[PDB]
Short mmCIF file of C-alpha atoms and ligand atoms in Angstrom, two decimals:
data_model
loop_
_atom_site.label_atom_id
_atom_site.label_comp_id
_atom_site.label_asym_id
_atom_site.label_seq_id
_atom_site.Cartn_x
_atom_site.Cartn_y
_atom_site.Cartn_z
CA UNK A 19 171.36 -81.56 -42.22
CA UNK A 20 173.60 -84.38 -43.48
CA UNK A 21 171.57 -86.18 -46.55
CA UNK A 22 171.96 -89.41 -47.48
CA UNK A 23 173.38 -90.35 -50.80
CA UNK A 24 169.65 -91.20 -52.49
CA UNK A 25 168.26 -88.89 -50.42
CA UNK A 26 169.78 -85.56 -52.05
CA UNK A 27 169.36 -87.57 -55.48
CA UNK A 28 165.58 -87.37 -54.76
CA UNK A 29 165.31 -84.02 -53.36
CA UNK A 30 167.69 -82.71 -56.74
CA UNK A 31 165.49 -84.05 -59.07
CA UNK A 32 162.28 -82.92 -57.38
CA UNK A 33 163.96 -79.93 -57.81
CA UNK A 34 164.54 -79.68 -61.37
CA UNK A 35 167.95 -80.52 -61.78
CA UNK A 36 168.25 -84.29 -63.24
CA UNK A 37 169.27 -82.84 -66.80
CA UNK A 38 169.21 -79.57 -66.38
CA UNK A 39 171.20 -77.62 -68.96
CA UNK A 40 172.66 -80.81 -70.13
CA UNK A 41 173.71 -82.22 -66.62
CA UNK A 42 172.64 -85.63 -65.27
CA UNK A 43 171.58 -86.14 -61.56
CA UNK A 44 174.76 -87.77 -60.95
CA UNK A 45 176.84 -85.12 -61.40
CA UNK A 46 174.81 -82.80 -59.62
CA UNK A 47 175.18 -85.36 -56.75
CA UNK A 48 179.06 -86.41 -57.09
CA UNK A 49 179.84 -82.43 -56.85
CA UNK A 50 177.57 -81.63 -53.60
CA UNK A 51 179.60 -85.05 -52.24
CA UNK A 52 183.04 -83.42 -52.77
CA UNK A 53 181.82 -79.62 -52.17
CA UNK A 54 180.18 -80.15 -48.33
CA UNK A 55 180.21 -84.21 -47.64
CA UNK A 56 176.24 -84.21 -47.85
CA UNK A 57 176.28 -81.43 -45.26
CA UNK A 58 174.22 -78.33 -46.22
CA UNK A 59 175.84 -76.58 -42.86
CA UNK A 60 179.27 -76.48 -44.34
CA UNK A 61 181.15 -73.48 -44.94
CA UNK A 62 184.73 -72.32 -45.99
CA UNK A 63 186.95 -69.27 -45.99
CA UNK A 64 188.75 -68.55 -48.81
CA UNK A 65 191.83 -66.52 -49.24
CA UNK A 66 190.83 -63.61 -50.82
CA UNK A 67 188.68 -63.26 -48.08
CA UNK A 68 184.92 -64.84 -49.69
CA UNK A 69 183.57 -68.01 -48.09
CA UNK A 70 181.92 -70.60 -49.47
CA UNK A 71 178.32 -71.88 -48.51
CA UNK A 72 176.22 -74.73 -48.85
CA UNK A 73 175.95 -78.75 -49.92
CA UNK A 74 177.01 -76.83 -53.40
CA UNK A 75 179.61 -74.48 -51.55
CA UNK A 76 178.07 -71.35 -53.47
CA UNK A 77 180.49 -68.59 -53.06
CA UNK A 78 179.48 -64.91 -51.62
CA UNK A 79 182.09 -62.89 -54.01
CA UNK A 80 179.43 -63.34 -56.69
CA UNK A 81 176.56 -65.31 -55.12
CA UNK A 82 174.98 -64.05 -52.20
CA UNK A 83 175.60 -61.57 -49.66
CA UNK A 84 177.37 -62.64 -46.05
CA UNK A 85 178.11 -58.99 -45.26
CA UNK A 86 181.92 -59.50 -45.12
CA UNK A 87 182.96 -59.75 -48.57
CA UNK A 88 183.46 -56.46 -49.56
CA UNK A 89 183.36 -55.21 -53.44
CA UNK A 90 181.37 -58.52 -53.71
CA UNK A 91 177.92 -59.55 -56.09
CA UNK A 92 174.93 -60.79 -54.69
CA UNK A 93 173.87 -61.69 -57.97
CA UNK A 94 171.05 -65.20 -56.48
CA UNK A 95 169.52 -61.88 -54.42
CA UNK A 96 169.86 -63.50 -51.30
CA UNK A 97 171.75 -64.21 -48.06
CA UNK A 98 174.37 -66.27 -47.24
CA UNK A 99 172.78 -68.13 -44.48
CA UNK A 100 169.74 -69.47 -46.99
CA UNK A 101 172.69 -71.82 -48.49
CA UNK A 102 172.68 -73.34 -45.00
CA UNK A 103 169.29 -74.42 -44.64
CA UNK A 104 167.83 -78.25 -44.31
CA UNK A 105 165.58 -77.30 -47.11
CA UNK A 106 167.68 -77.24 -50.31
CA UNK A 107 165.75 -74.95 -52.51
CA UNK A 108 167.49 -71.96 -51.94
CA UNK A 109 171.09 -73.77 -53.16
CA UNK A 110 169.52 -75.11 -55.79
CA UNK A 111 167.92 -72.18 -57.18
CA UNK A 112 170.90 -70.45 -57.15
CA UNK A 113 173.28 -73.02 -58.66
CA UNK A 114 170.64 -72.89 -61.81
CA UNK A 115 171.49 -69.30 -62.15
CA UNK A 116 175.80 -70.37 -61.73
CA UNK A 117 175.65 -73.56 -64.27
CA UNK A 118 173.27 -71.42 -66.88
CA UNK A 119 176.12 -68.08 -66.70
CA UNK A 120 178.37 -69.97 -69.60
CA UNK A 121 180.62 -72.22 -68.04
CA UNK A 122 178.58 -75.14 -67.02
CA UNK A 123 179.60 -77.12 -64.07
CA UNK A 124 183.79 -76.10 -64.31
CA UNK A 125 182.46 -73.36 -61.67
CA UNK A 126 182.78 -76.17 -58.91
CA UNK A 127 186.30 -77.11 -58.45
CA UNK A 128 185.20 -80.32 -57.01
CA UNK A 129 183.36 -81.39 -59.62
CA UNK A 130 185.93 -80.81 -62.11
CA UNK A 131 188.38 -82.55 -60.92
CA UNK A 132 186.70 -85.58 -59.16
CA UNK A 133 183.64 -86.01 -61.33
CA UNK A 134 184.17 -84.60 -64.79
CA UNK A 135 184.88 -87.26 -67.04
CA UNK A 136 184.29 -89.91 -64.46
CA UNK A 137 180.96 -92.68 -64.36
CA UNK A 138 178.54 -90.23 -62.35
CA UNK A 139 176.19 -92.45 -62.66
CA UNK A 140 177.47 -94.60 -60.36
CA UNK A 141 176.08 -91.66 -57.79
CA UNK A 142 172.30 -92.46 -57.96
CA UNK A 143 172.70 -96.47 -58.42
CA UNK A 144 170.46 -98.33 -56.41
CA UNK A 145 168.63 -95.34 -55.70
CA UNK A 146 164.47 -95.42 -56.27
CA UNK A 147 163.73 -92.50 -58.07
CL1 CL B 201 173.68 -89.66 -63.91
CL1 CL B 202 177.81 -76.88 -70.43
NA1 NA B 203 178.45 -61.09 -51.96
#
């Protein structure tokens, strides 16, 4: 599913995630942007040989397990192919358990370097929520 901009604001903070540990909705929605485009079927190989899942691009060397990543965590206790459903709950259950581990948001490349620091709130204007 591709999700409209106000759409995955919604979902997100139906979800729980509109402040959670210290995070506004608009970052949560300015990283999935620049992670997967909206598009909770995206995925992407990276070099060491993990690949990246999800509208949050959750990776499988510590995440979940895709069954190719050898050596690898599975520490969300789930598979790979949850992070690629319409229904978000799985990615967002999971990217609790990522921001809560002690580096906040930095674990999305994305979002530090296109939304850190940046008016994030400018991701859920206009929006009803
Ligand atoms: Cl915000
Ligand atoms: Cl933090
Ligand atoms: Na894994």
């Amino acid at each position: 599913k591709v999700f409209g901009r106000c759409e995955l604001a919604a979902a997100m903070k139906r979800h729980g995630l509109d402040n959670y540990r210290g995070y506004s909705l608009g970052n949560w929605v300015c990283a999935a942007k620049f992670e997967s485009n909206f598009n909770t079927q995206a995925t992407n190989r990276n070099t060491d040989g993990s690949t990246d899942y999800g509208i949050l691009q959750i990776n499988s060397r510590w995440w979940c397990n895709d069954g190719r990543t050898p050596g690898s965590r599975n520490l969300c206790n789930i598979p790979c192919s949850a992070l690629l459903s319409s229904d978000i709950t799985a990615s967002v259950n999971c990217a609790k358990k990522i921001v809560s581990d002690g580096n906040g948001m930095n674990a999305w490349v994305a979002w530090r370097n296109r939304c850190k620091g940046t008016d994030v709130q400018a991701w859920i204007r206009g929006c009803r929520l």
